[PDB]
Design a protein around this ligand. Sequence first.
Ligand SMILES: [Mn+2]
Ligand SMILES: [Mn+2]
Lengths: 322, 275, 580, 69, 176, 290
Amino acid sequence: TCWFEFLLEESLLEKHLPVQLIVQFLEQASKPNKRNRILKLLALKVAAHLKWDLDILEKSLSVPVLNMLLNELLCISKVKHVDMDLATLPPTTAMAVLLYNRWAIRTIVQSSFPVKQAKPQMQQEKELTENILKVLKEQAADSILVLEAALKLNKDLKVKTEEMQCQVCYDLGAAYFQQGSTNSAVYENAREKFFRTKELIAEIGSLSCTIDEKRLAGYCQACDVLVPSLTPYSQVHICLRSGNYQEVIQIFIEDNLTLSLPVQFRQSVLRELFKKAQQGNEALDEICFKVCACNTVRDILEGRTISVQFNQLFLRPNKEKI
Amino acid sequence: GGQVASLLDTNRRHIWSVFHAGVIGRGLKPPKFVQSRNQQEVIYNTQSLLSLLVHCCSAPGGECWGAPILSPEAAKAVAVTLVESVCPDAAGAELAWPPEEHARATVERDLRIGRRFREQPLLFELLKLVAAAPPALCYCSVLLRGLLAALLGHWEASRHPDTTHSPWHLEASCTLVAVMAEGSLLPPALGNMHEVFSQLAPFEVRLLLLSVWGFLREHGPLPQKFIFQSERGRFIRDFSREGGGEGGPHLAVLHSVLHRNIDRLGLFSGRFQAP
Amino acid sequence: DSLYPIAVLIDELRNEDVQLRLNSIKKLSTIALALGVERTRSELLPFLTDTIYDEDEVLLALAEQLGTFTTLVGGPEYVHCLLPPLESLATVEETVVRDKAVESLRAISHEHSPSDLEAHFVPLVKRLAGGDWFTSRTSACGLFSVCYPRVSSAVKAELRQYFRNLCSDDTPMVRRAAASKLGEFAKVLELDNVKSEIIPMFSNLASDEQDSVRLLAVEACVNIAQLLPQEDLEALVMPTLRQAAEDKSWRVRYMVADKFTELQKAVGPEITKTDLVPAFQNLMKDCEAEVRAAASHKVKEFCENLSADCRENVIMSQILPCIKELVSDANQHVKSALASVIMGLSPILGKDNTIEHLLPLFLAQLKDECPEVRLNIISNLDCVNEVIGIRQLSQSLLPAIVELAEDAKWRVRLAIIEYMPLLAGQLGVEFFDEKLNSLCMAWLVDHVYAIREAATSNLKKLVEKFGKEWAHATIIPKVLAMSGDPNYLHRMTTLFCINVLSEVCGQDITTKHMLPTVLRMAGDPVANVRFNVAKSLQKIGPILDNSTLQSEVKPILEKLTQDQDVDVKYFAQEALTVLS
Amino acid sequence: NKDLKPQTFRNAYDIPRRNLLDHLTRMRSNLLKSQVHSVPIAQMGNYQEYLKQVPSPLRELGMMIDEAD
Amino acid sequence: MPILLFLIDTSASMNQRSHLGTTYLDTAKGAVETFMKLRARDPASRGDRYMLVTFEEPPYAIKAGWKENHATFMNELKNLQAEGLTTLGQSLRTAFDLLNLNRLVTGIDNYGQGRNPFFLEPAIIITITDGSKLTTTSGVQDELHLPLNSPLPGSELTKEPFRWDQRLFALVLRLP
Amino acid sequence: FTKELDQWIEQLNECKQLSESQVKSLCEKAKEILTKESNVQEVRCPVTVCGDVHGQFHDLMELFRIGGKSPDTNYLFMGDYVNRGYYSVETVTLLVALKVRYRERITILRGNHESRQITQVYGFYDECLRKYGNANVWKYFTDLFDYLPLTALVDGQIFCLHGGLSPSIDTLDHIRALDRLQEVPHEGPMCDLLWSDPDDRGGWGISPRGAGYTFGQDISETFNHANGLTLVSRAHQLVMEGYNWCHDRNVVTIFSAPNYCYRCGNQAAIMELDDTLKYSFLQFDPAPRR
Ligand SMILES: [Mn+2]
Ligand SMILES: [Mn+2]
């Protein structure tokens, strides 16, 4: 099929019982007529045929085509977004602004990610994506307030308030985690949103919505490690944060038996302890020797070489060291 | 642990025509080299050599714990002879790190350094020995740059989806970033990301190593920055005074890599806090 | 504004690059399916007549799509309305539009009624030929032919006289087009009307000032000569044939020289014997090698279709005196064209005449420098063997065969191998063994793999003829000598001949001479040898004695199925499963 | 001295010892009724020159170059 | 009727590699290729004869003189080897000797009858070299001196080897 | 689930092309296989080494008739399986099908014509459009071309390679370190690797083509001595005798496309290697067509 055979067909979308077809509709309608409006209506209809699943639209349809799609949707139903609000709105124009701002947050999060550079038209798409990402960076706070205010509202193809809140609150927590790299206090809000998402997902278990369980689990683990408000890794982390090192030595001696912690983690904490003793705190010298000895036994049991730190610590050997 | 009659028989094998029009080279290639050596014996030979070097480097042997100060002059001597042995320098040998695109002009030298590191495993041991004295690792910056360029080239040219299919290169990348961190050519936040290298794919570890290169261009592994703090008798680098000592953009790209793979790097998120 | 299907969709779809124009043109069927039949039949065809800026990319596809329209136009009654835009399309200067358009128009004539085509098709030919452009007249003569089986005499006369006008035009390319359509039209017109109209036009276009029109008159000579077989023919095709025989136009002499056989069969033997044999005689000694090589293909058929009353007399009186000059010619292509067919005269000429005359010619062409001539000589020696017998063939031609058994070209050696079981089928074991058995064994170590597999089959046929009592004596030990060669392709040949001979040797014979050699190669360091061993055991599995099968063959296939190369693993597993 | 025109088939002293038996077989066969292909690269893809020294057949009825236009 | 004499330095210092990985002699030959590519663009430059001189000994110095076809010039340029000393003065003397060889027999140089701008044999010498110091068997000459041991007949009437219509250009390759 | 591959090989041997989905599945399987291959693919003797084929499918079947069927004879193909031929699709599909089916028994390297620009200009794209109507087959094949190895190494001695050497490359370890999964650039190591031509030269030289370099005997001598090679098998240029030794038998140019653009009248050749690395060249004339 094509854009013309689909334009005359009022039932072709009702027969194929797609995203490539949607981007074909947008590409033909990319240039500015009644054919344009018909193409937008068909694209919106077939997009709505998927129950508005941004988890399938985001991956295939690129950022500018999806931007055009939901901008056309907002032109269709609605009429800044932060100053307008009016969350007690008709269903369609509620979930439309909801989905648009969820998309806004999701693409900000996705744009922050690193993509694989293509080793081997592209310039126009790059410029357009850069421009829309720039204006999104300008107005990301408005979207955050809109989604946050909407999450506080539970007035209401109506969708369940539980799933409509869990998806958006997950997006809020992801956005805060994106900004958590800059302002560490932002992580607390991400923690609360993520715990709400975990509780809601465990409660209802909705499917349409569907969330990556592994991503949510890793998000919750990261928030637990970062903001405190257990496995030996987190035990070592809190012990280092609280200034207690004897339990670090004991859990390292136990780790020599279990072989649980990464060797890289042990070498890094040994280096951090050496750096802190280097900075001051003469009370750390025995702690540095103790964890160095623990790492050395871990290394010999794993069949790896003895470090330079151990060898220089055994210059001037002492009874207690031995 | 380093790496590495005629006419009578010919007449007998003859049939009234030669058939083959020649013999390429001297015939068949040999069955290649063979290696058989104990790993533990290698470990303890390395231990005896490294203990001797630490004895030679340290000052002659108060607090009943702690260690003597390794001489930065002795470790500087070890570093400069390591540089001379592995790559006789003066193509690019200034301590300043050049732009990343300059690595595409010295690629033969970087591959030579990479092969030397691969063949002779104790080059990493002597590298850590150099790193034990802080300012001495600056004088070995050519080796660090060359090995980093070789590893970046490998990760860019890796079609595998995980770093586990490149065991030596994974270990070399981990060891190289750990050695820079130990020598304080990186801040503790940037020097901790050898934990995650086993979890990532080649392109993000390539990005993180490029962030190492960018940070070293921005700050520079120079010995003049290592101020002599005489409270103990050894050199100190404090990146905070240099401005952006946390490595702002480099921390940003590392946190983006973490957030991409948050499903598996959740537990490691605590090793990269800027405060 | 833009919701209207035809203009708004099709023009804005055709405004894109070339491949999208081809796609959108191909989707013109769909725009007819979506709309009702009356709307398309009343609107769609005008815009096909309009916006003529489509470039050469889409015109053939558009013509084909108009051709496949058979129901979406309205039916057989309205299908005549595909005549105007397709005809206007036929006025395009490039060529492929014209033949593709007329092919489309001929197809939709199946739905056409007499009255329908009398009302539109014949006026279309009228206005088409009347056009001021040569393309219109070429399409006019192209579309001319399909009206005769449906029209009546009253407009048959109009068709005939308008065709007559089309013969005597002035611009050259319409003369070429009409000349081409004469031969296609000559097969359908009434013979009396053909005499009345076409023969004056065919004759005076055979003398046209343009060599192309003479060429196509030569083309239409057969289609105008396959009928009218009374004295008519004697005074019909004669002038043009005798003029074209030795014509100054080298191309006309070429294309006559490639068509004599069908003409000669169509007009009886004795008549050609009487009339065109000076032309045939002098054609073989022509100035250029082109026509000389063209005519030399037609010796066998011209002789075989001739009259037996004087066949040998006419052949030895006219063909051989010029065949002597042809054989000793300086052109390789002429001799190559000769050698492919002139050796088929051995049944026709007889046995004694063949030995007395044809054999020196065959030996002369066997020593020819050009290897294609040698290959063509070897091509059909079975007929010579049948009509001469093994005796004289082995007496005269055998040393030439020995010389070409080790020729530079591999194709010649391949040809020689094909007749070795044939000759050995009629020869004695002793003489064959001393003379050619070593020669047959010399081919299994040839460089080319075609030669190798060629004489593997030869060895199979020989063992099928002679028997194991001789294969053991001669073939097998020298094969086993070749089994130990360092060159792995020689071991391949050992495995292949083991495969082919085992089928025709004997179960005990295979199990006690073929099997241990195959058992040896299972330890070869080359994976090719090992998987070929697995495949060979699979092939010879149901041939040898079943007791030795699980006793000896099974353990190595249990070893081969754990070979490090996946290819040998797969082949050994398949052999294990099918052996059962 | 390269391109000194070795006379291996005319001089047995040019034969290497390792390449003696096979060369012996070759030049034994060559003497009976039954080096080359080392042309300079410049005159290696010359198709005009090659076709000039070949008989005629019967007549009919980004980057810069990639050879044969 | 122009003449384009190339005085390609073939001293062994031309074996220095640039960052391109090619020796200075390789870029020198490539610069000659680029020069004739650019020169052939002018359609009035069709009639033009190239010459080649190197730094070798006098029998071997000249590799394309007069009455040598362009194919021989190309073949000789491609096969040059940098194996000599930087005998730049001697090579310049033999380059000017090549150009001023035919001046007396055809009498373009009118001695005592006035200097005729309309009687000329145009030519330019392009010497592609490096900045390396001059070298002879004795040592480093450190200054360009032109030998006068074996004067061409009639060289006493001009007092300088270079003539009216001859100009010298240098491509001193300093590629690091 | 490999009988369909044998049926495709049999189907292609009759010059019948595969469908678009067949070509798609073939290209996915081939991409999966070729991703594992290094840039310098080590090849074990025996092996038959072939040069340019350039779309002449019937000449490729002639090559098979000369050297043997593909599972039975190990083959090495040094690039240029497309363009300048009437059956580029059929020959490249047959080579990819044999690579998929018999991955250890046939090696296919990358030539200079295995690039998007060269295929678009010189007519592999046009052939794909003629035989399929859409460029998706051409897109599939060109995306497959990035995965082909650049070079091959036979027993660590012979160094099969389509084009020639590069001034930027001195060791095989540089070639192994190349990121070959990309378009053939207009400069740099991979470009000169697929585009360079030996010559009776001194050092390097700018190529008459727009890419690569041209190198003399001393260059290839240094390359062979540095990398511990005896020979640099090569396939990029046209050869009249089928094969031609170059540079004091350090470089040999094998051409396997007889009557190259159906007009050159050139003879072809393939170089066989056997268990003792003894080379024999089989010259073959073009197959008899109409
Ligand atoms: Mn070519
Ligand atoms: Mn090529």
